[PDB]
Design a binder for this molecule. Structure first.
Ligand code: WI8
Ligand code: BR
Length: 134
């Protein structure tokens, strides 16, 4: 068992706030924003040894990352950015930092009651996306 266990499972998006504005700040173009904003992803989180896998499945894109905490990796995001990512666990929160083109965005995942809350921040702009167990 690991503390990381509270995240494992299959999660469905139930609410989103400010995601269009977050996407604008990240640089996502109009058409991608509209279709991505409409997505209702399921997030599947699993752990095998030291390797964590996060899959996001939707009608728009299916994406998957695997990683070890603290160990940088190259990632292609859903909006086709090529970023350098590092994911760590900080006080019970999964903190995902993406770096590209001299920019940075941070995505925090945390358990709050029966929800998995995803907070995405790009400069001044925060989007909050709430998932519940499928
Ligand atoms: O809730 C989540 O896990 C999060 C995201 C999410 O669900 N993103 C998408 C999901 C689908 Br489906 C399709 C497209 C996107 C998409 N994101 C973006 C830019 C903002 C990053 N551009 O497109 C992104 C931040 C955390
Ligand atoms: Br998705």
């Amino acid at each position: 068992g690991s503390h990381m266990d509270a995240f494992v499972g299959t999660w469905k998006l139930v609410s989103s706030e400010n995601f269009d504005d977050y996407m604008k700040e990240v640089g996502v173009g109009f058409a991608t924003r509209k279709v991505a904003g409409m997505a209702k992803p399921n997030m599947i989180i699993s752990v095998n040894g030291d390797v964590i896998t996060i899959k996001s499945e939707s009608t728009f894109k299916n994406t998957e990352i695997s990683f070890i905490l603290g160990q940088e990796f190259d990632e292609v995001t859903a909006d086709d950015r090529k970023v350098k990512s590092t994911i760590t666990l900080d006080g019970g929160v999964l903190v995902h930092v993406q770096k590209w083109d001299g920019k940075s965005t941070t995505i925090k995942r945390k358990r709050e009651d029966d929800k998995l809350v995803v907070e995405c921040v790009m400069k001044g702009v925060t989007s909050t996306r709430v998932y519940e167990r499928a």
